[PDB]
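quick one, two chains, predict together pls
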Amino acid sequence: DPMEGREDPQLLVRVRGGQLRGIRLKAPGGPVSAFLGIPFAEPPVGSRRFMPPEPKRPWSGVLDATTFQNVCYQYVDTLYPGFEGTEMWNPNRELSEDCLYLNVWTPYPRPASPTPVLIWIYGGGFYSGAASLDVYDGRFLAQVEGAVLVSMNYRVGTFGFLALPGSREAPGNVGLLDQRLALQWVQENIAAFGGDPMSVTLFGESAGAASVGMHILSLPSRSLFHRAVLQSGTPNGPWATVSAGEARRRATLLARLVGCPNDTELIACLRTRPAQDLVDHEWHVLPQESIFRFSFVPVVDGDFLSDTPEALINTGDFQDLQVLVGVVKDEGSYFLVYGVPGFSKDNESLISRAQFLAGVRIGVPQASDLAAEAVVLHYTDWLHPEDPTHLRDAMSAVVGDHNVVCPVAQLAGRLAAQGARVYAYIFEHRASTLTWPLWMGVPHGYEIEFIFGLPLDPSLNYTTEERIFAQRLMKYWTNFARTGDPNDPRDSKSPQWPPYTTAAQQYVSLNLKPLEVRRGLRAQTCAFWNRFLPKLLSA
Amino acid sequence: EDPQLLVRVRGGQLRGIRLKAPGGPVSAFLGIPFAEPPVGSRRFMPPEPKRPWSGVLDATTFQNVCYQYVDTLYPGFEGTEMWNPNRELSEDCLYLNVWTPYPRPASPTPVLIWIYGGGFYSGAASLDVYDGRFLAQVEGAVLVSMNYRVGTFGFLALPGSREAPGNVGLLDQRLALQWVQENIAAFGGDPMSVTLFGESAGAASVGMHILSLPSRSLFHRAVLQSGTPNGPWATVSAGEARRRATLLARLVGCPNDTELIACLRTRPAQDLVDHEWHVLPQESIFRFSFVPVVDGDFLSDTPEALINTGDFQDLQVLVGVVKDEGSYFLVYGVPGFSKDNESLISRAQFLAGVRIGVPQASDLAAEAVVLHYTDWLHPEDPTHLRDAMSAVVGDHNVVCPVAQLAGRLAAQGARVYAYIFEHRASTLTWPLWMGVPHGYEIEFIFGLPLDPSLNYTTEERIFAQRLMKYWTNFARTGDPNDPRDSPQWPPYTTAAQQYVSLNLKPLEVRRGLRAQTCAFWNRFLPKLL
């Protein structure tokens, strides 16, 4: 670079591919280094669509790493024009298939000694999301905790997860392979930023959490990280994976919907289609009317996933693993306004008993008549079986328990029973700035802004208590990243966060009040979902 | 010659006896015959009215107990012996008892008629716990209790046959009812104010009188304590009754219905008793061999159907349960349970126990029961498992059938009051883990704690007086609340599901009688049994 000598010497870094120049960003407490839009793969475009990522080839000169890159091609929610509750999750950069870039935040100047690395994997149902969203801003953890934080884009929707299992051209799970390639990039290069490749903690929410779980369950990924955090998502459960037959079914149907016919010719025809056509048709291939079900998700391929996640967590040895797992207070509430008759964000969504039964059929699409009746039985308040408020809240609880809370309880149980050190939480604080109605409680995904420390930015109008709270959570998360223990070794005054064990089943509540220890994560109910009901899910 | 002790009934003259109650004297007329003795060829047959007699019939003493199995699980133990026959066994047993105030009531008095329980195989009106002198003296009530045939003698049935039609124990009860209608006024009783009350099998009996049209002109109100005509144990089908009768016949060497029954009538009573427990279809508890049969006569249909389609608009009903309905029965057949230790069982024993307590359960149903009653925070804790086993039996056999009955009756016009009885007698000889077992509210209802020699506590005496007041208020008005007065006891309704707790503390109103769990038993599980 001819202008290197006139520029900030503290923002120049070399990695395997070549030289990069980052940017000095302002965090409330001081500056941070950001290296944004670093390519970790060759653009998965044209003939590379549906294919595993190829490592980015070295470049000449100085790569401009000062701004976020393109967002992977995806559906954009336009249900509520101008509504913050949806818009804050929408892409904030141009959509492109050329999207395999990652981002790095570090202290400014960069750390002098090797520093624990946090790697964020975003959620969004495997059909959406971006590492560039404001809610995933790494600057606060970097400045306040001194963390090195990395986040990557990975392909979503058909581009990431359309599969014709067994084929060469569309093997499936390539979004997960994008994630893995980013993990390898970190292993080779993070030391140049002052990061410690021997202390890497994965964390993610929802589909990002399911992703993290799948890296736990896939051997080639295991040498690429040391600890994991799963927020409101699991590799097990009803939505995070499909079987090979179902993947093939869905891919074939989509292909027919966009006008395409041997796997090779089908896939080639698909590769001739515009990205937006694939996006425009991906939602028409689900087998039933449903919520919290996504068309193109990880597939049990016998490769990346050697078996079903339930099998793998049932037979796995997790002795050298420390994991942090948890849920928010109202996991199911959000999804109700997206397909259950009678629900809306703009009224109180008080429903009738008929609407509750129908809603149970939509939320548990695999339930036989008997299974559905059993769910209705368990969740009805038989003292007030017609009360619209109880029915609304019960609908929410059915969806949240089925898709998140009980799969999390199941995971935590299996991991703890088979060697892993497990910490469990429930997140119960509702953001003062939330624009979703009060009846939705603490919805899916609204702990994230507190983990990343956004309330520390005064311009965002959080309360003082919320700033303190955020600082607490940042401390828990980075403590866990550093030591595999969220507790402060110096702070014996504060209540301790005990490990989750099958014997005591202890977890903690995260809210404005000090840590409270509780026992049994929805134990009766999750026994219902995880032990009794699985036989009967067939319709 | 005490004229207060000489009474003329339709059959002739009776001489009673003056008894001492704590507050004063009462008149007792004990061992009054109300039927021809059901002996010889009258075995298994409907009762015939007692023929008139000459002179003055001695009614100063309890008559014989109807022939029945005697419990020998714990010989000499009060907890069991207080339920055993306290007079001689005889098939010559169809007698009733009357308690009245001394002197005989000036104006017509509400009548309370007790029907004892004991699984339709046992029981007697002469037991100390059914002593009517306290209610008669304190509340001024006229109390009647009758002996009725039990076991094979009262319920062995060959449906369709002339000689053993079934339900003749219920017919014994009915004949005693019609006797009260014809004769009770001579004792100062009001035949237009008659209240049936009974516990367990007695409660189920009361229920069946509610559901049998000819019984309905013979009473006006009913109390069902820890039992119901609906449910898994109170009735059998005609086919199953016939099966059990034929098997019992086989076991005693008998041999066409006529000749089978003839041969059965040749057998000594103790033969039949000796073999009655060998005809149950499965290993079980809270199941009894010879019980009321759905005959299409006394019971025109199943009790479930009848409570579902019945019109109960002019009926007032008091129903309830005790805190631990299931506990007593565990020591009578569930491995790992005993009165002499704390019965801390294992999980395997819990599953097996569930198979015994819910014998009709498919594997799926049993797994569902295990799932529902397991404390998944402590799935192996012996104490939890034991208490859970108790709850499974109590809920399946009593609590949830009671909830269903109360709900149906309420929904279809009846005035219903409901309770849960939660006080453990200070004198109870069963172990503490059994809590408030099946049947241990009776002694308080009958007012036994008012006898200082039985050494109950002062508070228990006050409690007994409260309950006697509730029951006789209900008998008098169809409302347990004091007609003038203390939180009010609200009627049970399907919408609010209110019931009260009966204990040393003042009335507390609660809502929903094990609502989730009884929804599980009454709505979900029946398909899978």
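Chain A is about 30% helix and 15% strand.
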